[PDB]
Design a protein around this ligand. Structure first.
Ligand code: CA
Ligand code: CA
Ligand code: ZN
Lengths: 75, 155, 77, 77
DNA sequence: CTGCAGGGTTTTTGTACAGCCAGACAGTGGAGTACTACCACTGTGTAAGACAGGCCAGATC
DNA sequence: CACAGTGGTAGTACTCCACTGTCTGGCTGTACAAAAACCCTGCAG
DNA sequence: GATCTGGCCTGTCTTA
């Protein structure tokens, strides 16, 4: 399979070039899809014209750091 | 500095023009076919990148030596389309774990029955081996069967 | 023109998501105790970007145009 | 009535108390005893004449529906 | 015009008398307080395309 | 060697219900001076 | 009427 080849031949060279593998994984987007589904069902206008704009705005607001600073509020 | 790494293999092959995905040329980073990668498993060097793929599409399109289709494909090493976007030459973690987990799941299935004694089984015995494997895994490891190998079942 | 799509401009979303981290970039500058007025032009940012598709996204009646079920999302970090 | 999960509500409570609180919302452990009246098996009641084939205990809460199945292997499982 | 220097302007910044309320301190015995860990387990990963073999059907001498 | 959750239970940690005296910090009537910072004017290039 | 070869067909493997 093509993954057995990739993982038995090219792994040392990969971890030497950059220094990491798992830190550049596709997890961030795969898991963000969950947020996309929950924002297209609960937080967007129910119309074909406007709704991509609402999902985009609310998903940009959920992923800010400045608004995540207040979730801890110094414990 | 941009590093495009969050693509799965389907999209890595689409965005770089290579043919996908059960092709003779298995590696996105190396030029070995299926045969030379089943022969020598652990010795290869990364070659593929963006600029050389552009140049190889040029060679496949101008075709300066008047070669036949099947042999020009081997000379250009799988570049049948023009690359559209540059992606760093890296491996994706999650789908790699999933591929290896489905590979061991198939190995275990072969093992339950005797596959290396009787080399030609039917679909009936294949379904029976899979069924007993899933029943045994559920009884002890606490894993219901899966339609498709998701990451958590692979951990 | 069947496809519906929405997107920020690249450089504008870049500068906004970069200025949002100004808190932590200045706190890292103070923690390392580096010079502030000095060494202002030597920064370097490394940015991972990802692309991905998604199946069986249901569609709605609306007013048009007709649209496929599959959706594609391009995002950066 | 706002479909807030318990852990999300505790997050809201901690954030609203840590900043300028002056805490408004109640903690979780006082909510968990607040609804013991709303759920079944709290008020006293009685039928007449006494019901047939039904026990008279008036405090039975969530009961498992299997209703005493003799899970032993040889029967219908 | 610039520069500095006695003093002015008004304004602050604080110490000064002197009486007096508001809340912390100690404590206690324990309560109920409130905040944490532990426990298994979830979701977002989701369809065509490549290749080898067998064979059949129509064109040719 | 994803990762942010999901609600209930047991445990620790603390912060309080009452009795008590004591203590410091900060409020109020003008008087009294030391700093503040421009602005004047005074004497000099 | 025999023969030959291109294309049709089906099963398996790969990532999803
Ligand atoms: Ca996908
Ligand atoms: Ca995909
Ligand atoms: Zn390779």
């Amino acid at each position: 399979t093509n993954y057995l080849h990739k993982t038995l031949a090219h792994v040392p060279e990969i971890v030497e070039r950059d220094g990491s593998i798992g830190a550049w994984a596709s997890e961030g987007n795969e898991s963000g899809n969950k947020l996309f589904r929950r924002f297209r069902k609960m937080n967007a206008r129910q119309s074909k014209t406007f709704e991509l704009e609402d999902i985009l705005k609310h998903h940009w607001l959920y992923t800010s750091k400045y608004l995540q600073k207040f979730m801890e509020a110094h414990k | 500095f941009f590093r495009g790494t969050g693509y799965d293999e389907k999209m890595v092959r689409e965005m770089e023009g290579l043919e996908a995905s059960g092709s003779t040329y298995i590696c996105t980073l190396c030029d070995s076919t299926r045969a030379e990668a089943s022969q020598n498993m652990v010795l290869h060097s990364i070659t593929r990148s963006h600029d050389e793929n552009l140049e190889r599409y040029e060679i496949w399109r101008k075709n300066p030596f008047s070669e036949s289709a099947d042999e020009l494909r081997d000379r250009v090493k799988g570049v049948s389309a023009k690359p559209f976007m540059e992606t760093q030459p890296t491996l994706d973690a999650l789908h790699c774990d999933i591929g290896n987990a489905t590979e061991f799941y198939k190995i275990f299935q072969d093992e339950i029955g005797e596959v290396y004694q009787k080399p030609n089984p039917s679909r009936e015995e294949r379904r029976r081996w899979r069924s007993t494997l899933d029943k045994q895994l559920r009884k002890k490891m606490k894993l219901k069967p899966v339609m498709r190998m998701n990451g958590n079942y692979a951990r | 023109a069947d496809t519906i799509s929405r997107r920020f401009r690249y450089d504008v979303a870049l500068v906004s998501a970069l200025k949002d981290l100004e808190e932590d970039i200045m706190e890292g500058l103070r923690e390392r105790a580096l010079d502030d007025s000095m060494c202002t032009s030597g920064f370097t940012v490394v940015v991972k970007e990802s692309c991905d598709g998604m199946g069986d996204v249901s569609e709605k009646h609306g007013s048009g145009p007709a649209v496929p079920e599959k959706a594609v999302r391009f995002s950066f970090t | 009535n706002t479909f807030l999960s318990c852990s999300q509500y505790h997050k809201m409570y901690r954030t609203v108390k840590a900043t300028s609180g002056r805490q408004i919302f109640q903690p979780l452990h006082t909510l968990r005893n607040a609804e013991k009246e709303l759920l079944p098996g709290f008020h006293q009641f009685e039928w007449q004449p006494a019901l047939k084939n039904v026990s008279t205990s008036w405090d039975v809460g969530i009961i498992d529906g299997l209703s005493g199945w003799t899970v032993s292997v040889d029967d219908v499982p």
